Each structure stands twice: as structure tokens, then as C-alpha cells.
Amino acid sequence: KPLPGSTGEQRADLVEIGVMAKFGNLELPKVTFPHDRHSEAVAKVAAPGKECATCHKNDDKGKMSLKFMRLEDTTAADLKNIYHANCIGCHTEQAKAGKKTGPQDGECRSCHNPKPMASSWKQIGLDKSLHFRHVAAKAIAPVNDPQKNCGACHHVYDEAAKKLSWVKNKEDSCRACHGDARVEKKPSLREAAHTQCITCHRSVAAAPAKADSGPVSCAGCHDPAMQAKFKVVRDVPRLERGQPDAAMVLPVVGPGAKKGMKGAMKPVAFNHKVHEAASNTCRACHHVKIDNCTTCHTLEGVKDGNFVQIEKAMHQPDSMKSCVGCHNQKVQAPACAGCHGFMKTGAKPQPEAACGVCHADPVGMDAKTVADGGLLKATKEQRADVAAATLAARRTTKGTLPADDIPEFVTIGVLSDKYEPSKLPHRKIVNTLMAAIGDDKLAGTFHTDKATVCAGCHHNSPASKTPPKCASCHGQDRPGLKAAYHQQCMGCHNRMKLEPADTACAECHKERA
Ligand code: HEM
Ligand code: HEM
Ligand code: HEM
Ligand code: HEM
Ligand code: HEM
Ligand code: HEM
Ligand code: HEM
Ligand code: HEM
Ligand code: HEM
Ligand code: HEM
Ligand code: HEM
Ligand code: HEM
Ligand code: HEM
Ligand code: HEM
Ligand code: NA
Ligand code: NA
Ligand code: NA
Ligand code: NA
Ligand SMILES: [Zn+2]
Ligand SMILES: [Zn+2]
Ligand SMILES: [Zn+2]
Ligand SMILES: [Zn+2]
Numbered sequence: 153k154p155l156p157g158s159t160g161e162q163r164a165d166l167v168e169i170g171v172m173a174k175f176g177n178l179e180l181p182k183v184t185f186p187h188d189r190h191s192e193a194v195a196k197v198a199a200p201g202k203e204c205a206t207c208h209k210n211d212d213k214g215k216m217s218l219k220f221m222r223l224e225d226t227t228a229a230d231l232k233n234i235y236h237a238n239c240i241g242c243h244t245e246q247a248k249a250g251k252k253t254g255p256q257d258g259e260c261r262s263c264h265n266p267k268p269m270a271s272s273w274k275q276i277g278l279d280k281s282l283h284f285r286h287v288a289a290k291a292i293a294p295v296n297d298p299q300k301n302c303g304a305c306h307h308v309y310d311e312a313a314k315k316l317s318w319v320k321n322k323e324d325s326c327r328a329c330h331g332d333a334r335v336e337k338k339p340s341l342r343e344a345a346h347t348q349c350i351t352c353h354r355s356v357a358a359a360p361a362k363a364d365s366g367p368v369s370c371a372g373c374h375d376p377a378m379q380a381k382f383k384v385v386r387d388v389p390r391l392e393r394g395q396p397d398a399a400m401v402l403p404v405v406g407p408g409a410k411k412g413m414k415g416a417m418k419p420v421a422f423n424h425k426v427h428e429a430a431s432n433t434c435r436a437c438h439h440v441k442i443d444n445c446t447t448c449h450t451l452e453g454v455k456d457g458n459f460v461q462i463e464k465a466m467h468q469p470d471s472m473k474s475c476v477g478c479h480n481q482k483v484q485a486p487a488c489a490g491c492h493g494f495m496k497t498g499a500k501p502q503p504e505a506a507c508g509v510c511h512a513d514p515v516g517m518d519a520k521t522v523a524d525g526g527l528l529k530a531t532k533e534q535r536a537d538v539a540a541a542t543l544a545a546r547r548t549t550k551g552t553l554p555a556d557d558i559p560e561f562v563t564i565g566v567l568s569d570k571y572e573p574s575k576l577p578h579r580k581i582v583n584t585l586m587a588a589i590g591d592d593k594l595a596g597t598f599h600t601d602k603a604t605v606c607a608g609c610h611h612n613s614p615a616s617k618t619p620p621k622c623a624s625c626h627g628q629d630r631p632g633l634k635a636a637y638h639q640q641c642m643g644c645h646n647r648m649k650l651e652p653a654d655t656a657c658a659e660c661h662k663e664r665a
Contacts, residue, residue: 162272164374165189169235175228180260184268188369201358218346239263274376279432280388291356291363305348321394325434328441390428397425398539400514400527403462404446406454413451417511419527421542426593439473469498475510476502479594487588488595490644491608509598515541551586552602557617558582566623567634571661609640
């Protein structure tokens with residue numbers, strides 16, 4: 153790392169102007185334009201709310217253009233002139249006026265710099281806290297509703313009224329519909345944001361009410377040091393959009409043939425409300441749009457889902473979007489990692505004991521009826537009600553076996569030579585692992601017996617209050633007895649991150665002589 157004093161200046165301010173490349177190859181470098189420097193310099197000379205008007209024009213509606221001295225790109229010749237005439241224009245007059253200003257007519261490289269400075273730029277969005285702060289800001293006024301703020305920002309195209317409108321409980325993240333470039337009359341996310349966000353912030357700032365507003369300068373949203381200063385709400389209430397607290401995820405077959413696939417598992421009740429809280433975003437799971445998975449993911453798979461079948465969509469050990477997948481990742485947490493890194497949970501075929509945790513007999517419907525497909529042709533409401541009851545029927549372990557079955561100490565001296573036998577704080581470690589698990593819901597639901605966690609070290613043998621010796625399958629079943637101990641014992645202390653420069657071979661046994 154280069155000394156802190158020679159790392160150079162960075163801005164979140166920099167606009168790379170290269171729009172001309174839309175008309176061919178460039179003779180010279182793209183021009184680097186420090187936006188915040190310019191708007192601050194103008195806020196001084198421009199007296200009215202005309203600060204941005206100096207360089208941005210309005211359309212026939214009044215929506216400010218995000219283009220420089222123009223409403224639309226046109227001729228490679230018209231644009232080259234719009235820039236030099238207005239850019240050098242203003243620099244020239246200001247220089248006559250004795251003001252510090254930008255590059256003048258002959259100073260080509262100075263605008264066309266091949267070696268501009270470093271960006272400190274950073275992306276921004278509305279996480280749970282920031283979103284709630286807008287949901288709750290009385291300055292953003294309720295729109296088409298007695299109290300709900302949503303219509304101020306969210307909308308669908310009513311292909312009928314020919315108008316964009318706030319449909320209640322249809323609101324979805326800007327990314328669902330706004331992408332990298334613009335499709336048709338639909339802006340890119342970049343323009344979409346810059347339009348709505350900055351326009352509203354400026355309205356509030358300008359308003360008689362003098363209420364707090366949002367940033368307008370580039371660095372105010374995009375500088376990392378500026379983002380750190382946003383106040384954070386650590387209590388963000390649930391985001392209410394009409395979603396189910398409980399849901400039946402079903403083996404829907406594609407509206408193709410009925411190829412006579414039916415299904416091989418009982419259905420799955422899904423606790424939606426619990427997963428909302430444990431997730432940063434809806435889009436994490438609803439990765440295209442907020443809809444439902446079986447729209448695009450069916451038993452046999454459909455074009456609209458790139459044929460990723462529903463089994464794949466719910467199990468990919470590889471994928472954060474899938475049930476088992478995400479869970480496979482949650483298990484990488486230090487408290488879980490000690491058993492689970494040793495079990496290799498995402499790297500072997502998932503045990504059949506775990507299938508029934510999700511795939512359970514639904515509660516509140518006749519068994520025959522469920523095979524008959526009863527849940528498939530049934531109100532959204534009957535499914536909601538059935539899922540809630542199914543979820544509520546669910547068992548849960550807390551704690552493990554009773555201490556009298558868990559020896560307090562275990563001496564391992566089968567190998568004792570350079571070291572004395574290691575005295576294993578057996579019961580203490582179990583208690584602490586149970587303690588580390590806490591009241592974690594993933595743990596408490598997927599650990600189906602009180603004895604389950606014993607397989608976190610006593611693997612490959614039948615679940616038992618009396619497991620076999622390690623030397624059973626280890627020695628002369630790959631690692632030897634010593635490496636088995638060393639790999640499992642140090643393995644977990646490492647993954648659990650409880651000890652580094654504090655490591656002594658003395659921890660688990662005394663050296664002799
Ligand atoms: C007499 C020296 C200059 C010459 C010969 C020159 C030449 C050119 C040419 C040929 C282009 C077309 C795009 C390309 O081929 O790269 C261009 C674009 C541009 N020039 Fe200059 N320029 C000069 C000075 C300046 C100065 C001093 C400024 C800043 C006030 C400036 C700002 C721009 C901008 C903003 C563009 C459009 C950005 C883009 O490339 O898309 N130029 N210039
Ligand atoms: C506080 C009032 C202003 C606001 C809110 C504003 C906002 C914006 C936004 C949102 C963009 C697009 C950013 C991007 O996607 O990279 C932009 C671009 C730009 N702005 Fe401003 N601006 C303001 C004032 C000015 C002024 C006074 C100038 C002239 C010194 C200026 C010159 C430019 C230029 C040259 C671009 C690059 C786009 C192009 O080449 O056409 N802006 N501005
Ligand atoms: C898109 C055309 C423009 C380009 C490419 C451009 C580019 C630049 C650059 C590269 C600098 C930094 C020079 C330095 O570090 O000393 C600068 C500074 C400056 N420009 Fe521009 N400029 C443009 C248009 C304008 C316009 C229209 C105005 C007048 C409203 C203006 C006013 C200024 C001022 C006042 C400074 C110095 C402010 C400060 O000290 O931070 N520029 N410009
Ligand atoms: C109480 C009425 C509202 C509801 C029910 C609502 C709901 C939602 C939902 C469900 C999402 C997608 C969340 C995700 O995928 O993580 C979202 C995103 C978003 N909402 Fe709202 N919203 C409301 C009001 C507003 C308002 C008033 C604004 C503007 C001040 C706003 C701005 C946004 C933005 C910018 C995003 C995208 C966040 C990002 O990805 O950075 N919302 N909203
Ligand atoms: C996705 C576009 C938007 C982004 C990224 C954004 C971002 C932000 C940020 C970061 C803040 C807090 C700044 C701070 O604490 O210093 C803020 C505040 C605010 N924003 Fe936005 N905003 C966006 C759109 C909007 C829109 C469309 C409106 C108007 C409906 C709006 C209204 C407000 C208000 C009223 C505040 C001040 C609330 C308060 O803290 O009392 N914002 N915004
Ligand atoms: C005039 C200074 C600004 C410049 C030069 C600028 C530039 C940019 C650029 C280049 C992107 C897209 C990057 C990409 O495609 O990956 C972007 C995205 C964005 N900007 Fe700005 N921005 C400015 C000010 C602001 C302000 C003041 C806000 C807050 C109202 C804001 C909010 C956003 C948002 C929400 C996005 C979308 C992030 C995403 O792509 O997920 N920007 N901006
Ligand atoms: C290795 C044990 C498992 C097997 C063999 C298995 C098998 C299957 C199969 C074959 C399907 C397609 C539909 C059907 O044929 O009925 C399915 C769907 C599904 N599975 Fe699993 N699964 C297992 C474990 C799990 C677990 C642990 C979860 C919860 C994290 C889960 C959640 C789901 C969901 C949500 C669906 C889609 C809804 C449905 O059609 O039932 N599965 N599974
Ligand atoms: C607060 C953000 C969220 C909102 C607003 C939301 C909303 C919804 C809605 C409205 C539905 C019902 C779709 C319909 O039948 O019309 C749904 C279903 C579903 N959501 Fe979410 N959700 C959010 C977050 C999540 C997260 C984070 C996950 C993953 C942990 C998730 C997983 C699911 C699943 C698996 C379904 C069932 C789809 C099916 O039955 O095929 N949701 N969600
Ligand atoms: C919240 C319900 C959903 C879940 C849990 C889900 C899950 C998944 C998973 C696990 C994959 C493949 C692994 C990966 O790429 O990470 C996938 C792929 C895909 N999904 Fe979904 N999905 C859901 C909803 C949807 C919806 C509603 C659509 C259609 C609008 C859709 C369209 C697609 C497409 C086109 C792919 C293929 C892209 C790829 O290979 O990643 N999905 N989905
Ligand atoms: C539709 C597929 C899924 C099913 C059937 C499923 C099922 C479950 C079940 C049964 C639990 C135990 C707690 C309870 O039931 O209240 C749970 C917990 C959890 N799941 Fe899922 N899940 C799925 C997808 C996901 C995904 C995609 C993620 C990551 C975005 C995820 C993250 C979690 C987390 C973090 C917990 C722990 C809850 C807590 O501690 O509050 N799940 N899941
Ligand atoms: C709070 C952190 C933990 C979480 C979130 C967690 C989560 C889970 C989940 C989701 C499963 C079922 C998934 C599958 O079998 O593929 C599971 C199984 C299991 N967990 Fe954990 N666990 C945690 C901590 C632990 C600890 C500390 C131990 C050891 C004392 C442990 C031992 C086991 C065992 C033995 C199984 C059964 C594997 C088999 O079927 O053979 N877990 N855990
Ligand atoms: C890098 C420091 C270490 C060295 C050089 C070392 C060396 C050895 C050797 C040579 C043996 C074979 C038996 C003997 O000669 O007495 C052994 C056994 C063993 N070590 Fe370590 N060890 C170290 C750290 C650890 C740690 C940190 C743990 C606990 C997390 C541990 C747990 C064990 C166990 C359980 C045995 C088998 C006990 C027996 O059968 O006597 N060792 N170790
Ligand atoms: C409550 C669940 C558990 C039960 C009932 C249990 C029970 C037992 C029993 C009966 C023994 C035999 C003692 C002897 O040979 O004299 C033993 C040994 C052992 N247990 Fe556990 N245990 C459990 C959990 C664990 C866990 C979670 C770990 C890993 C931290 C573990 C690690 C060991 C080790 C290393 C031995 C020594 C075996 C050898 O050296 O061959 N046990 N356990
Ligand atoms: C047979 C191999 C192992 C040996 C010889 C061993 C030995 C020890 C010893 C001597 C301590 C106490 C250190 C002190 O108080 O200064 C300890 C603590 C601990 N061990 Fe192990 N360990 C082994 C395997 C494991 C495994 C596989 C795990 C994870 C599943 C684990 C998790 C822990 C934890 C969490 C503690 C801290 C408990 C507390 O201080 O309350 N150990 N171990
Ligand atoms: Na002027
Ligand atoms: Na010239
Ligand atoms: Na459903
Ligand atoms: Na070793
Ligand atoms: Zn969805
Ligand atoms: Zn009901
Ligand atoms: Zn004791
Ligand atoms: Zn250790």
C-alpha cells in the first residue's frame with residue numbers, strides 16, 4: 153500500500169464526457185468534468201433557483217434535461233460545437249472577469265486529459281433504513297391515499313389510461329423495470345434515479361417548509377465519506393405491500409401439457425414474514441420482479457424462466473436465490489462454521505432427514521385432497537390459511553440430550569507419546585456450542601433431534617447417545633487417527649475464530665520431558 157501521503161486526490165465528482173463516440177472513433181481523450189466544482193461555482197453567480205438552468209434546459213413539460221446545453225443528442229457536428237462554444241465560452245468570459253476558471257481555447261489536453269485523477273465514487277440505494285426514512289418523512293406528502301407515501305415514487309404503466317400511475321401494492325424496486333440502457337420510453341435506472349430523486353430533493357429544499365431533504369450534489373449521494381454520515385434507523389418496521397405472512401410453494405406445472413408430470417414430494421409451507429426480516433431486500437429472492445417463483449419456475453421448466461426447473465430453483469446448493477443454497481451460506485457463520493465446515497454441508501448431497509423439514513404434510517386439508525392436487529386449485533386464501541397452520545404445527549428442538557448422557561470429560565491418550573493425553577472439556581464444549589447456536593431459527597428447525605448436534609463431530613455413524621471411537625474408522629476412512637483429531641479439533645477453533653498469535657500446542661495437551 154502506497155504511503156497515505158502519496159495516494160492522490162480522489163473525487164466522486166467526475167463526469168467522463170465521451171458522448172461523441174456515439175458518432176464514431178474519438179480523435180482525443182474523453183473530457184473529465186468535475187461536476188460539483190462547477191455547480192458550487194455557479195450557485196454563487198446564479199441568484200435565483202437558476203443554478204442548474206445555466207447548463208441544463210427543460211423540456212416542454214418542465215422536467216430538467218440531464219444533458220448539457222441541449223434536450224437531445226443530434227449531430228456529431230452539432231454536439232462538438234455545443235461543447236466548445238459553451239464550455240470555452242464561459243471559461244473565456246470568466247477569465248476576462250478575473251475569475252478562477254476552466255481551460256481556454258487552445259488548452260486541448262487540459263479538458264482532453266489522458267491521465268485524469270482517481271474516482272472515489274460509490275453506488276447508493278435505499279436500504280431498509282433509508283427507505284423507511286422516506287416512507288416516514290412528512291415532507292413527502294401522501295399521494296392518492298390518506299397516509300401512504302408510496303405514490304410519490306412508485307408507479308406502473310396503466311396500459312389503457314395511457315398513463316404511469318401508482319398502483320397500490322404493486323410497487324417494486326426501480327430495477328425490476330429500469331435497466332442499464334433505456335428500452336423505449338423507459339429510462340435507464342441511471343436517468344430514472346437522477347430525475348426523480350434529485351428533482352424531489354430540490355423541491356423540498358426550495359419549499360417554504362424548510363424541511364430536511366436529500367442530497368443534490370454528486371458527492372452528497374456518491375461520496376463514501378458522505379454516506380457514512382446518513383443517520384440510520386435500527387428498527388425499520390416491516391415493509392407493508394400486501395404480502396403473505398405464510399405461503400404454499402407448489403409443484404405448479406407449466407400451462408403446457410398435462411409429459412404427465414405430477415410431483416414427487418409433499419408441498420412446502422414457507423414462512424414469508426420471518427424471511428423478510430432476515431433479508432436485506434425483497435429483490436434478493438425476487439430477483440427479476442416481485443411476483444411468485446412458479447410463474448417462471450415449473451415442474452418441467454419454461455422459456456420465461458430460462459427453463460430453470462423449480463427443483464433447481466429451490467435447491468441449487470450454489471445459489472443464494474435457492475432455499476437450500478442460501479441456507480448453505482448462512483451456515484458459514486462462525487458460530488455454525490465449526491460443525492458445518494467439518495460436515496461440508498453445501499458440498500455433499502443433502503441428507504434425506506432434511507427433506508421432511510420443508511416437505512411436510514400440510515395441516516388443515518384432507519391428505520387425499522392434497523395428492524388430488526387440492527392446493528393447486530384452491531383460493532390464495534385457503535393456501536395462506538393452510539400454510540400458517542402447517543408452519544404452526546412444526547416441531548422445534550431447544551437444547552440437546554440431558555447432561556447425564558453427555559460425559560463431562562473424555563481422555564484421549566490412545567496416541568500419547570510426545571504429549572500427555574488430552575483432557576477433552578467434553579460437556580463444556582457442547583453447552584457452549586448450544587449456547588453459540590442460541591435461538592437461531594435455522595438451527596432450531598433443521599436440528600430435528602436433540603441428539604442431532606452430536607453428529608457435528610461424531611459423523612458417519614448412526615445417531616446415538618453412545619457414538620463409536622474415532623479410532624473405529626481411523627488408522628491403519630482417509631485421515632489417520634492423529635490427523636483426524638488435529639483436523640477436527642483445530643479445524644473448529646479456527647472456523648469459530650475464538651483464539652491467532654495466542655496459539656500454543658499446549659492448549660489441548662501437555663508436552664512431556
Ligand atoms: C484547440 C484544442 C482542442 C481541440 C483540437 C479539440 C478537439 C476536439 C474534437 C476533435 C472533439 C470531438 C471528439 C473526439 O474526437 O475526441 C472534441 C470534443 C470535446 N471537446 Fe475539445 N478540443 C480542444 C479543446 C477543448 C477544451 C479546451 C475543452 C474544455 C473547455 C474541450 C471540450 C470538449 C468536450 C466537452 C468535447 C465533447 C466530449 C466527447 O469527446 O464526447 N475541448 N474536441
Ligand atoms: C445543482 C444544479 C444541477 C444539477 C442537479 C445537475 C445534475 C446533473 C445530473 C443528474 C447529471 C447526469 C449525471 C451522470 O449521469 O453522469 C448532470 C450532468 C452534467 N451536468 Fe449537471 N447539474 C446541475 C448543474 C450543472 C451546471 C451549472 C453545469 C455547467 C457548469 C452542469 C453541467 C453538466 C454536464 C456537462 C454534465 C454531463 C452531461 C453532458 O455531457 O451532457 N450541470 N448534471
Ligand atoms: C461541458 C463544458 C465544460 C467542460 C468540459 C469544463 C471543464 C472544466 C475543467 C476540466 C475544469 C478544471 C480546471 C482546473 O482544474 O483548474 C473546469 C473548471 C471551471 N469551470 Fe468548466 N467546463 C465546462 C463548462 C463550464 C461552464 C459552462 C462554466 C460557467 C458556468 C464553467 C465554469 C468553470 C469554473 C468557474 C471553473 C473553476 C471553478 C473551481 O475553481 O473549482 N465551466 N471546467
Ligand atoms: C409505503 C409505500 C411504499 C411501499 C409499500 C414501497 C415498497 C417498496 C418495495 C417492496 C420495494 C422493493 C424492495 C426490495 O426489493 O428490496 C421498494 C423499492 C424502492 N422504493 Fe419504495 N415503497 C413505498 C414508498 C416509497 C417512496 C415514497 C419512495 C421515494 C421517496 C420509494 C422509493 C423506493 C426506491 C428508490 C426503491 C429502490 C431501492 C433500491 O434498490 O435502491 N418508495 N419500495
Ligand atoms: C432513488 C432516488 C433517491 C435517493 C438515492 C435518495 C436518497 C436520500 C438520502 C441519502 C437521504 C438522506 C440524506 C441525509 O441524511 O443527509 C434522503 C433524504 C430525503 N429524501 Fe431522498 N432519495 C431519493 C429520492 C427521493 C424522492 C423521489 C423524494 C420525494 C418523494 C425524496 C425525499 C426525501 C426527503 C424529504 C428526505 C429528507 C427526510 C428526512 O430525513 O427528514 N427522496 N434521500
Ligand atoms: C451530478 C453528480 C452526479 C453524478 C456525476 C452521478 C453519476 C452517476 C452514474 C455515472 C451512475 C451510474 C453508474 C453505473 O451505471 O454503474 C449513477 C447512478 C445513480 N445515481 Fe448518481 N450521480 C450524481 C449525483 C447523484 C445524486 C445527488 C443522487 C441522489 C439523489 C444520485 C443517485 C444515483 C442513483 C440512485 C443511482 C443508481 C445506482 C445504481 O445504478 O444502482 N446521483 N450516478
Ligand atoms: C434432499 C431432500 C430433498 C429432496 C429429495 C427434495 C426434492 C424436491 C423435489 C423432487 C421437488 C419438486 C416438486 C415435487 O416433485 O414434489 C422439490 C420442490 C421444493 N423443495 Fe425440495 N427436496 C428436498 C429438501 C428440501 C428442503 C430442505 C427444502 C427447504 C429449504 C426444500 C424446499 C422445496 C421447495 C420450496 C420446493 C418447491 C415447492 C414444491 O413444488 O413443493 N426441499 N423438492
Ligand atoms: C419485503 C420484501 C418482499 C416483498 C414485498 C415480497 C412480496 C411477496 C408477494 C406479494 C408474494 C406473493 C406473490 C403472488 O402470489 O402474487 C411473495 C411470494 C414469495 N416470496 Fe416474497 N417478498 C419479499 C421478500 C422475500 C424474500 C427476502 C424472500 C426469500 C427469503 C421471499 C420469498 C418468497 C417466496 C418463496 C414466495 C412464494 C412464491 C411461490 O409460491 O411460488 N420474498 N412475496
Ligand atoms: C422468489 C421466487 C424465485 C426464486 C426463489 C427463484 C430462484 C431462481 C434460481 C435459484 C435460479 C438459478 C440459480 C441462479 O442463477 O442463481 C433462477 C434462475 C432464473 N429465474 Fe428465478 N426465481 C424466482 C422467481 C423468478 C421469476 C418470477 C422469474 C420471471 C419473471 C424468474 C426468472 C428466472 C430466469 C430467467 C432464470 C435464469 C437465469 C439464470 O440462469 O440465473 N425467476 N431463479
Ligand atoms: C422457498 C425456499 C425456502 C424455504 C422453504 C425456507 C425455509 C426455511 C425454514 C423452514 C426456516 C426456519 C424458520 C421458520 O420456518 O420460521 C428458514 C430460516 C431461514 N431462512 Fe429460509 N427458506 C427458503 C429460502 C431462503 C433463502 C433464499 C434465504 C436467503 C435469501 C433464506 C434465509 C433464511 C434465514 C436467514 C433463516 C433464519 C431465520 C432467522 O434466524 O430469523 N431462506 N428457512
Ligand atoms: C446457528 C448456526 C447454525 C445454523 C444456522 C445451522 C443450520 C443447519 C441447517 C440448515 C441444517 C440442515 C441442512 C442440511 O442438512 O443440509 C443443519 C444440520 C445439522 N447441523 Fe447445524 N446449524 C448451526 C450450527 C450447528 C452446530 C454448532 C452444530 C454442531 C454442534 C451443528 C450440527 C448439525 C448437524 C449434525 C446437522 C445434521 C447433518 C446431517 O443430516 O447429517 N449445527 N444445521
Ligand atoms: C501445532 C501444535 C501441536 C502439535 C505440535 C501437536 C502434536 C501432536 C502429536 C505429536 C500428537 C500425537 C500423540 C503424542 O505424541 O502425544 C498429538 C495428538 C493430539 N493432539 Fe495435538 N498438537 C498440536 C496442537 C493441538 C491442538 C491445538 C489440539 C486441540 C484443538 C490438539 C489435539 C490433539 C489430540 C486430541 C490428540 C490425540 C491425543 C492422544 O491420543 O494422545 N493438538 N498432537
Ligand atoms: C450431546 C451430543 C453428544 C453426545 C451424547 C456425545 C457422547 C459421547 C460419548 C458417549 C463418547 C465416548 C467417551 C469415551 O470413549 O469414554 C464421546 C466421545 C467424544 N466426543 Fe462426543 N458426544 C456428543 C457431542 C460431541 C460433539 C459436538 C463433539 C465435538 C465438539 C464431540 C466430540 C467427542 C470426542 C472428540 C470424543 C472422543 C472420542 C475418541 O477420542 O475416540 N462430541 N462422546
Ligand atoms: C478432540 C479435539 C478437541 C480438543 C482436544 C479440544 C480442546 C479444547 C480445550 C482444552 C478448550 C478450553 C480452552 C481453555 O479453557 O483455555 C476448548 C474450548 C472450546 N472448543 Fe475445543 N477441542 C476439540 C475440538 C473442538 C471442536 C471440533 C469444536 C467445534 C465443534 C470445538 C469448540 C470449542 C469451543 C467453542 C470452545 C470454547 C468453550 C468455552 O471456553 O466455553 N472444540 N477446546
Ligand atoms: Na455566463
Ligand atoms: Na480554437
Ligand atoms: Na403460493
Ligand atoms: Na497432524
Ligand atoms: Zn417474485
Ligand atoms: Zn381464511
Ligand atoms: Zn465438573
Ligand atoms: Zn484452539
